[PDB]
From Swiss-Prot, chains B, C, E, G, I, K:
This protein's name: Insulin B chain
Record annotation: effect of changing residue 10 to D: In HPRI; Providence
Residues of the full protein shown: 25 to 54 of 110
Length: 21, 30, 30, 21, 30, 21, 30, 21, 30, 21, 30, 21
């Protein structure tokens, strides 16, 4: 999930938009 | 833009920035 | 605990503290 | 809603806790 | 609510949230 | 103190109230 | 991405997220 | 300038990106 | 250093930076 | 007091330093 | 004042505090 | 640079002023 994608690994601002409503 | 490590409160501040009025879900268990 | 006055990103920080590993949903009007 | 209430007036931690998953 | 690791500036932001108008002391030497 | 209870270890929001005035 | 309303230190947080390792310059009027 | 625009009105991430090195 | 305009949690962040390991006390009116 | 001064007007780092332990 | 470790967004929040209207540059590559 | 001086190592508020404009 978000933690693995963005904290443990590394994510872009676009990947972060995957968790917007 | 860039890719960085975003963790904890920093992660939800980034979701706030990126999503804004759309809103978002933060669900660390997955 | 005391009542809160929270705007913008300060609401998201408070939700993060309150919810911990449960996470939360952020859903503004409009 | 909560987002607007906490900013235009006040809100409690107990009200916030309602938005946890 | 939950239990998490709260360190540094994050710790004093949580004390601010929790204490508010009561005020608080942050005394890391103890 | 607070660091040991809340950073090194793990504390609840109620334990944090121990450091309110 | 959504448009932003950012004041004070919130602008600096947004610049930090946007720029990553490139860094940035913060230059207010006057 | 950007500092004032984002605060008195609104600004985009794309406008912010102009201030990266 | 420059003069500051600090409200809410931003004051607590500034006190944290200024005081370091000495810590500080936060004591609002009323 | 300092809490109100820094928010309704302005304050310096030197004034803040007075609140350190 | 004190010396502490200031990293990431915390580093640029401290530069904001310290520099204010002067503005500042954050350039991690150097 | 700033990272080495302030994050990797340890810096004062005065050293931080070295990066003001
Ligand atoms: Cl951190
Ligand atoms: Cl604010
Ligand atoms: Zn703020
Ligand atoms: Zn942090």
């Amino acid at each position: 999930g978000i933690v693995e994608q963005c904290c443990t690994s590394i994510c872009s601002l676009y990947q972060l938009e995957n968790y917007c409503n | 833009f860039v890719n960085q490590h975003l963790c904890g409160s920093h992660l939800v501040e980034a979701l706030y920035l990126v999503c804004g009025e759309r809103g978002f879900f933060y669900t660390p268990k997955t």
